[PDB]
């Protein structure tokens, strides 16, 4: 990344405080609610007819945990997100047909969730560093599209 040692440390330290279970479920559900068109990829999850139905949907919650998990592991390879997400980039392209823009929407949803959770702790400088990571991750994942 073009992360400053200071920026790296900020990312790393807040992350340490994250419950991926809860944050993953919420980020993905919020995505499905704020930007309803992203639901086109989760037809099989069920009833996403309402905020409550999305937020309550266990398939959504569990998919959320899987997504943040992989995200979480990528924070360990911040100096090579490209290589960390290569196989995932091909998958998303070749099997899933997910438009990379959704990677971007999620990213911003993630930052909103983090702010939501951490209040005060989630400062301008901390958000700045997180914005670089989400951007970085999205690029990494979209990297193998052809």
């Amino acid at each position: 990344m073009h992360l400053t040692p200071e920026e790296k440390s900020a990312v790393t330290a807040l992350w340490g405080k994250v419950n991926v279970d809860e944050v993953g479920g919420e980020a993905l559900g919020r995505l499905l609610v704020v930007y309803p068109w992203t639901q086109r990829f989760f037809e099989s999850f069920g009833d996403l007819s309402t905020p409550d139905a999305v937020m309550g949907n266990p398939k959504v919650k569990a998919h959320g945990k899987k997504v943040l998990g992989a995200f979480s592991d990528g924070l360990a390879h911040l100096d090579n997100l490209k290589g960390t997400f290569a196989t995932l980039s091909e998958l998303h392209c070749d099997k899933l047909h997910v438009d990379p823009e959704a990677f971007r929407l999620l990213g911003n949803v993630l930052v909103c969730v983090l702010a939501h959770h951490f209040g005060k702790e989630f400062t301008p400088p901390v958000q700045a560093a997180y914005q670089k990571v989400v951007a970085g991750v999205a690029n990494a994942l979209a990297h193998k599209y052809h």
Partner: protein, 141 residues
């Protein structure tokens, strides 16, 4: 908002398209598939090969809708309601992709109507495509 001027511009340049709208529709698609490969994620079911009949068939449908929008330049929201509903509810194309297509349509027209593709007309067609895209995306959330 489209001005009388804009309207005249669009009707005139689209006027020139005539019977090539279909072919120009197919070409704008190919241009888009080639320059912005992420747009391809919406046509997994398509043969995106050069001269694909699916692409031909699709380019005509798109051109027909634009032609329909020009015909109803004073009532686009209503002339396109159905297509607006389809995109919002079934297709669910991310909004960003409209701009990509619009762009490739402009390139296509530019490539075919050199005499008409003036700065003024260019500007008018760009505002037009933007308007169409807004209508098609209006019922998204």
């Amino acid at each position: 908002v489209l001005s009388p001027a804009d309207k005249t511009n669009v009707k005139a340049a689209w006027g020139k398209v005539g019977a090539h709208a279909g072919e120009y529709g197919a070409e704008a698609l190919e241009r888009m598939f080639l320059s912005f490969p992420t747009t391809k994620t919406y046509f997994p079911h398509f043969d995106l090969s050069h001269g694909s009949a699916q692409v031909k068939g699709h380019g005509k449908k798109v051109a027909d809708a634009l032609t329909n929008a020009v015909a109803h330049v004073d009532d686009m929201p209503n002339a396109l309601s159905a297509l607006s509903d389809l995109h919002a509810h079934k297709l669910r194309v991310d909004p960003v992709n409209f701009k990509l297509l619009s762009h490739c349509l402009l390139v296509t027209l530019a490539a075919h109507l050199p005499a008409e593709f003036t700065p003024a007309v260019h500007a008018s067609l760009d505002k037009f495509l933007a308007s169409v895209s807004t209508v098609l995306t209006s019922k998204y959330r």
